[PDB]
Structures are given as C-alpha cells and as structure tokens.
Design a protein around this motif. Structure first.
Motif, short mmCIF file in Angstrom:
data_model
loop_
_atom_site.label_atom_id
_atom_site.label_comp_id
_atom_site.label_asym_id
_atom_site.label_seq_id
_atom_site.Cartn_x
_atom_site.Cartn_y
_atom_site.Cartn_z
N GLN A 43 3.44 -6.17 -7.85
CA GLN A 43 2.18 -6.85 -7.60
C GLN A 43 1.18 -5.94 -6.88
OE1 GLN A 43 2.98 -10.54 -5.58
NE2 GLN A 43 4.47 -11.23 -7.12
N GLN A 44 1.00 -4.75 -7.43
CA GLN A 44 0.07 -3.78 -6.87
C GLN A 44 -1.37 -4.12 -7.22
OE1 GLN A 44 0.32 -0.75 -4.82
NE2 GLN A 44 -1.84 -1.35 -4.85
N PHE A 45 -2.20 -4.29 -6.20
CA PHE A 45 -3.62 -4.56 -6.39
C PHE A 45 -4.37 -3.29 -6.78
CE2 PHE A 45 -2.24 -8.02 -3.67
CZ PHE A 45 -2.85 -9.11 -4.27
N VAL A 46 -5.19 -3.39 -7.81
CA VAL A 46 -5.96 -2.25 -8.29
C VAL A 46 -7.42 -2.64 -8.46
CG1 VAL A 46 -3.93 -1.38 -9.49
CG2 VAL A 46 -5.61 -2.74 -10.73
N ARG A 47 -8.30 -1.65 -8.53
CA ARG A 47 -9.73 -1.91 -8.67
C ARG A 47 -10.19 -1.50 -10.07
NH1 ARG A 47 -13.37 -3.26 -5.14
NH2 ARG A 47 -11.87 -2.89 -3.44
N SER A 100 -11.39 -12.27 -4.41
CA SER A 100 -11.38 -10.82 -4.29
C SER A 100 -11.98 -10.35 -2.97
CB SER A 100 -12.13 -10.18 -5.46
OG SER A 100 -11.48 -10.45 -6.69
N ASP A 101 -12.94 -11.10 -2.46
CA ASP A 101 -13.56 -10.76 -1.18
C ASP A 101 -12.73 -11.28 0.00
OD1 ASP A 101 -14.89 -13.39 0.03
OD2 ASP A 101 -15.27 -13.41 -2.14
N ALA A 102 -11.81 -12.19 -0.27
CA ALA A 102 -10.90 -12.64 0.78
C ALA A 102 -9.73 -11.67 0.92
CB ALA A 102 -10.39 -14.04 0.49
N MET A 103 -9.48 -10.93 -0.15
CA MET A 103 -8.35 -10.00 -0.20
C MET A 103 -8.75 -8.56 0.11
SD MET A 103 -5.75 -11.48 -3.06
CE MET A 103 -4.28 -11.40 -2.05
N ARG A 104 -9.99 -8.36 0.55
CA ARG A 104 -10.52 -7.02 0.85
C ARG A 104 -9.56 -6.17 1.68
NH1 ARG A 104 -15.11 -10.37 2.76
NH2 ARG A 104 -14.13 -9.92 4.79
N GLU A 105 -8.98 -6.77 2.71
CA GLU A 105 -8.15 -6.06 3.67
C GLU A 105 -6.83 -5.57 3.06
OE1 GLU A 105 -7.83 -8.07 7.37
OE2 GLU A 105 -9.81 -9.01 7.24
N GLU A 106 -6.51 -6.04 1.86
CA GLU A 106 -5.29 -5.63 1.16
C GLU A 106 -5.32 -4.16 0.75
OE1 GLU A 106 -2.50 -7.14 0.68
OE2 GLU A 106 -3.08 -9.10 1.49
N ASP A 107 -4.16 -3.61 0.44
CA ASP A 107 -4.08 -2.22 0.05
C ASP A 107 -4.33 -2.14 -1.45
OD1 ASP A 107 -3.44 0.56 -0.27
OD2 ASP A 107 -1.36 0.00 -0.70
N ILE A 108 -5.47 -1.56 -1.80
CA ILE A 108 -5.94 -1.53 -3.18
C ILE A 108 -6.18 -0.09 -3.60
CG2 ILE A 108 -7.60 -2.44 -4.82
CD1 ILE A 108 -8.35 -4.55 -2.78
N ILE A 109 -5.60 0.30 -4.72
CA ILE A 109 -5.69 1.69 -5.14
C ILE A 109 -6.53 1.84 -6.40
CG2 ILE A 109 -3.46 2.18 -4.13
CD1 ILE A 109 -2.29 2.16 -6.93
N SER A 110 -6.72 3.08 -6.83
CA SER A 110 -7.51 3.38 -8.02
C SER A 110 -6.59 3.70 -9.19
CB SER A 110 -8.46 4.55 -7.75
OG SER A 110 -9.01 5.03 -8.96
N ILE A 111 -6.85 3.09 -10.34
CA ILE A 111 -5.97 3.25 -11.50
C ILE A 111 -6.40 4.38 -12.42
CG2 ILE A 111 -4.74 1.11 -11.86
CD1 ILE A 111 -8.38 1.74 -12.94
N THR A 112 -7.47 5.08 -12.05
CA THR A 112 -8.01 6.15 -12.87
C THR A 112 -6.94 7.20 -13.16
OG1 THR A 112 -10.30 5.89 -12.13
CG2 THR A 112 -9.65 8.04 -12.99
N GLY A 113 -6.72 7.49 -14.44
CA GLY A 113 -5.73 8.47 -14.84
C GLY A 113 -4.34 7.90 -15.05
#
Lengths: 314, 313
Positions: A43-47, A100-113
């Motif tokens: 359940q990894q959060f991504v942008r 999405s704005d409530a979850m801001r503080e979560e660890d969110i990474i970039s999926i580029t590549g």
C-alpha cells in the motif's frame, strides 16, 4: 534480535485490505518469492502526474518495482477510492483530492522511472473472476521479472542487500561515504542525519542545520505539504520544490534572506512512517536555489541525487 | 468454471484479520501447501464444552484439521475476543457470551473428533517475537502433517476430492447413496435437501417435510439456537437436541404431537454461510425421539451419522 524483521514483515501483510483480491495475490507473491534480501512495502502511496495521490499494492524499493491488482471499481472497501486510467506507468487506483490533502503527512514517493506489473483478476468484468491457474501464472511471470531484475542488479554489483538493523543507523551511511536516492534512505530522526555529516548532536528541535564541512550547503528538514507556518510543494518528478509562508510579510523578509545564501540545501523531508505512525525523515536529494519571488516563493531545483557523508568533527 | 473456486479461496484469505500474525501464517500455510483439492476455511466458529463460542484460524473439513496461531492476549485487533485455557483439543481463543448471542445464526461446528495444531510466534512471551526460521519450521511441520493426513485418507479411500461445482448439487449425494457427517454436507436450500430424498420441488417454504420412502422419518430444518417462536439447543457433541417454545402452552400442545408423530428426524440445521451471510443448511445427522415433557421440552438423541438417499418418484 532478528525479531524486528519478523515484526516488520508481519505488519506489512497484516494491513487492513484496500482491495478484495489484494491479500491473496500479495501474500502469494511474497511467500513464493521467499527472498527477504529484497525489501518490500504494501500500500505504497505515490504521486501521479496530475498531482493526485494514488497507491500501489506491492512495492520493491531496491528494484523500483510496483505490483498492482486490477479489479473494477466494484469490490472496493474504501469509499471514496477511485478507479481511473492514468499515465501509462502509473497505477489505476487513486485517492480523491478530498482525502489526498488529509493524507499529506504520509510518506509519498515519486513513481517516475518505475515499472508497474498488473494482475488482472477478472476474466469478464464486471463480475466473474478468472481461474486460479491463470492468476498463478501471472504471479509466476511477475516473480521471474523480480528475480531477473535482482540478478541484473547484483551482476552490475549495484545491489545492496536489505538489513533492518543497520539501515536506520547513520554510522553505516558514514561508512558508505555517500547517501543516495537509490539507497532509499530514511532516518528515524534529525539528530541522526545531522550525525551523518559530522555533527555529534544529542537532540535537534530546529528545522535546519548548517553543513559542518560545507558552508554553501544547508541541511534542511522541511514539511513538503502545507501546514500552520508554511506552504511547501514538491513536483511529482521530485525535481522542483516550492517554498512559501502563510504570512506574506515573513516571505518578504525571507526574500533577501534566501537571495544571499546558503544556495545549496540537502533535503530530508518529514514523513510519517508507514508503520507505527511516527515521524521519519527521507532524503529527497541535493537542491540548489533557483528563484526568489512572491506567490510561489522560493524555488529549488534538484542538482544532485547523492551527497557525500562525513565522520564526526572534534 | 474454476472461477467459483478462485472467488472462494480469495474471500477466505481476504477476511478481516482477528489476529496480527494471522494473515501471514495462514496465507503461508495455504500457499506452501498449494493443494487446492483440499478445502479450507478461515475463522471457523466452533462450540466449546462450556457452550462458549470459540474460533480457529484455519480449518480443513476433509482432514478435520485445525490450525491456530498463539499471540497471547496482547495484540488483538478485536477487543471482542477473550484468551483463556481450555481442553487440550480446544482453541485458546473464545468469544464473550455477550456477542456469542449475536453469533447464533452463524455456522458453528463440533470439534470433538478434530485435532488442533498451534503456532507459537513468540519465543518466550512477554515481548519479542520469534525469528522467522522457527515460525517457518512450525508452518512446515504443520503442512507435512496435512499432506500425510491427506495420504492416510486417500489410501483408506475415504477421501473425496473437493469440487465446488458438485458439492452443493443434490444429485451427487443421490449418486453417492448416502449423506454422511464426515462428508461435511451443506446445501444451499431446503428444496435441495428435500430433493435428495426423492422430492420434486420448485421451492420449499415449510419448516419440515415427511420422508417420502419412510413414514417413520421427518426431514427437519430447525434453527438450533433460540429465536422468537422456539427455544432450541444442541450439545457440543451434537448428540442431543432439545426443543422447547417461548410459550409453555405451545410446548404442552406439542407434547401429544411429538409422542404420536414420527419418532425419527433427519436434521438439517439452518446456519449462515461463513461467506456472503446467506441461509444454509448443514446435515446434523439422524435423530430419534427420546422423551417429551413440559419445562425442558422435547429431547432428541442422534441415532446415526449417515442417512440413505433416494431417487425421485
């Protein structure tokens, strides 16, 4: 105490399920692989490219590999979660901008590549599921993709095996000589990352700290979302960080402040730990100051993906 | 097609977890086993000797094998459970009687013949969990125990492979010649079990139906728990069923009906499906009428664990 590893792994498969087929597929992948030298996250959060926050069901940080279960919008425990098409390498399951704005503080990474492998569990959508044999086949080819990626990495000798005990310990990164984005570096507190660059600190309550051996560069511990004091943003690619404040006056007095220096900033972003909900700091890169302005505020471009480390100073 | 099997398995490992370590252990057991000819159920409700409702984390009906994870009382996502010691073959985890009365309509089975394997995830509790190697060892010995049990069953040829498609179809049990307690027989509706014994039916709304080829026997579809109309109980062994009514008068008027009516009853108990929460009917055996009286009401003892089945007339 290898038990910690156990704990971690357990909790990862002990998460409350987002999707109906998630548990089975994920558990089968992990168990059939049975190689724990590979770190994994569920359940990894991504942008996404559209700035929306999405999530992938299984994630290998070392191999930069995501795995996502494809069900229709039907059979989803979370309302509102969203099933939509997104950029080709990006997941189908996204979060509404409201949550999405409530979850801001979560660890969110970039999926580029990163690459995403999908498991299609429906033969005829909506309704009737596919047979177990087909699903097991998909899981098998995915596993072989993972293994062959791991091999592609170990033969190139760029592969560093996973250890829970030493990964949060600054001393190991000092020993390495460098901190890289590819090393997926997250440290448990500010004093640690400070101690990577030569500080001896017992505790650090401040947001920034000067680099001991380089006066041009500043260690920064920013919140990359909006909060009480500041409005900060980071591009989906992770290349550009914008910094503003709620008070325009303070930005005005911070304008010249930014303009003079230090022009370089080593960035460790404050993020919530995916487990046990505690604050951690992830290395986002080495950034250089681009621009001073109203509105968007200061603008930082990422000039480096790695920074060299140092032994403590005395 | 095989899709039904898929769905079933998915949902079985897709249950909301009672225990923190449950998911990992259960899933690993199932996948490492990788024998889907073996039916399995997660979070199977069972009845203890003391009538409290307990549950086991993994259950194989064909092998009568239970698997339970021991985390102790500390880590529970459910604060609605209780951790206590019970008979050697009985689970450590029980439900408080307050919500046990909420679970009546659920499908609850008898563990009297079944064996339970435990997985201790703590080397020594309190505190630190055990290392993965130890846990994997426990899981492995359990799995090979399962395999060898399956082999002892196939050599004895008492082993009927699991088929989702044919297990709810009356025709297969008619072909079988018998409905047995060991076959773990549950049918989707009353008309089906009726059609097992020779009836031809579109639907059946009645509580009971007279056995076509025996005027001696009555096919019964009771709720074995207490409800608005009736008070029914069944011993943990499944040997004795008591039937009373909320109205003592109706019991009194049912006395003559019981003593005069058919002395034998083939019992199919109404239970909720563990998945999809729909009414199902599980075969409880063949019972014979022992005694009827006021207060405690009618008493039925189980004379047979298997009953002959018949083709339609």
């Amino acid at each position: 105490a290898s038990s910690d590893l156990t704990d971690y792994v357990i909790r990862q498969l002990g998460r409350t399920k987002n999707k109906r087929y998630e548990a089975y597929v994920v558990s089968r992948i992990i168990h059939l692989l049975n190689d724990f030298t590979l770190k994994f996250v569920t359940q990894q959060f991504v942008r996404l490219s559209n700035k929306k926050i999405a999530l992938t069901d299984l994630y290998f940080p070392q191999l930069g590999i995501h795995i996502e279960v494809d069900e229709g919008h039907h059979f989803l425990r979370n309302s509102k979660m969203e099933y939509s098409l997104n950029q080709i390498d990006e997941p189908l399951y996204s979060i509404s901008q409201t949550e999405s704005d409530a979850m801001r503080e979560e660890d969110i990474i970039s999926i580029t590549g990163h690459k995403i492998f999908r498991v299609n569990v429906f033969k005829n959508q909506e309704g009737q599921p596919q047979n177990l044999e087909n699903i097991h086949q998909q899981i098998d080819k995915i596993i072989e993709e993972i293994k062959t990626a791991k091999n592609k990495l170990i033969e190139a000798s760029t592969f560093k095996e996973w250890n829970i005990e030493t990964e949060y310990n600054p001393q190991t990164y000092i020993d390495l000589g460098r901190i890289s984005l590819a090393d997926n570096v997250v440290l448990k507190t500010t004093k640690d990352v400070c101690n990577c660059f030569g500080y001896s600190y017992k505790n650090y309550q401040r947001g920034g700290a000067l680099h001991p051996y380089k006066k041009d560069t500043l260690i920064w511990f920013p919140r990359l979302y909006e909060n009480k004091d500041w409005i900060n943003t980071i591009s989906p690619d992770g290349l550009t960080i914008t910094e503003k404040s709620t008070d325009e006056t303070i930005t005005l007095k911070k304008l010249e402040e930014w303009k003079n220096g230090p022009q370089k900033r080593i960035v460790f972003a404050r993020v919530k730990d995916n487990l046990s909900s505690r604050a951690m700091y992830r290395f986002m890169g080495l950034y250089e100051f681009q621009k001073a302005d109203l509105k968007d505020g200061a603008v930082w471009k990422r000039v480096k993906s790695e920074v060299q480390t140092y032994s403590p100073k005395e």
